[PDB]
Design a protein around this ligand. Sequence first.
Ligand code: HEM
Length: 357
Amino acid sequence: HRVLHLRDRLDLAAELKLLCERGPLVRIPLEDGSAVHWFALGYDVVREVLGSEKFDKRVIGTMALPGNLLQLDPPEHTRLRRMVAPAYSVRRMQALEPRVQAIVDDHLDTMASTGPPVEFLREVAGPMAARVACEFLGIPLDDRGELIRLTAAYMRELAARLRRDPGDGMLGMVARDHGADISDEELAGLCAVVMNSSVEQTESCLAAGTLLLLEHPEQFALLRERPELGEQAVEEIVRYLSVFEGLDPRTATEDVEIGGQVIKKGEAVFCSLLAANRADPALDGFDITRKESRHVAFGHGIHHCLGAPLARMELRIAFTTLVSRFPSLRTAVPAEEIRFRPPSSNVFTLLELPLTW
Ligand code: HEM
């Protein structure tokens, strides 16, 4: 379903806009007759689907990893998520905040030292996101360089080690509070999701979000003058970018009414976060002074991003510190020359971001 990933730079491509004109829920019978698919394109309908108990995340023919919450349905999903959820409480993010600020400052220190220009994605955003993830996980300091490199069995041995001798961070918390109830492979899988796909989403928000701010220089400056706008800005940035563009299909376990339409048992629904966040032209222009941003960039319901508290805090700290420390930041090429990754279900990202100051 490539149309769900068609963009014009950061905006929707005309072909996807035309699809969205077909209403918030679009029936897609497959030409070969093999299945009936549905596209959920509107904010309300996406929330209807994602909050419903009448869908599962089955594999459909139209890698399974231990500890990967996104591939579990209740009740195992509920069991595992309950064990790990406390690593993201407000108490946990509050304690982590100054250490994340310091890691952000470390990386802007490196940026300030190497001097301009920099390829911001590879040299700043990536390392920053990976280092914050290590700190959140409580990876032993001696292992962080190697873990980040390998990320680009080891994970299990790392989990086995840091477990039998608990430490700090999410991994230490889970092992200490639920040691017997979680295997080394499951703990490794929890780590892998944080270090791999989560860093991908976060790094892409950091780099493409920086571009977006630079493309709206009045708002770049506004965030420097009014850093209390940071939480609002992050909501508007994750909405506008929609770096996680489309979700894994939800298969109806019984006939179910969605958006006034009957989705039949066994039919698969594809939720477009991109369309839901961007296809309403009323409130689409980028504006960090919006006090409340309407979006589903982190999903909704039982699979709502477990990392959203960390992501929101890390992005707020990063964007606010960046605009403060580099008031003269600009793209080192015209924005129209920036390359974006071609249509894919992979994370939406730019390919490089040359910046100067
Ligand atoms: C801007 C960054 C991020 C975005 C846009 C994002 C987006 C999402 C979305 C849309 C989902 C739900 C997928 C679905 O329902 O099919 C999700 C799930 C998840 N996210 Fe994130 N994510 C981000 C960062 C993070 C981070 C930093 C972490 C961990 C530290 C994380 C961990 C997870 C996990 C573990 C799940 C699965 C939860 C479950 O299935 O119960 N994510 N994410």
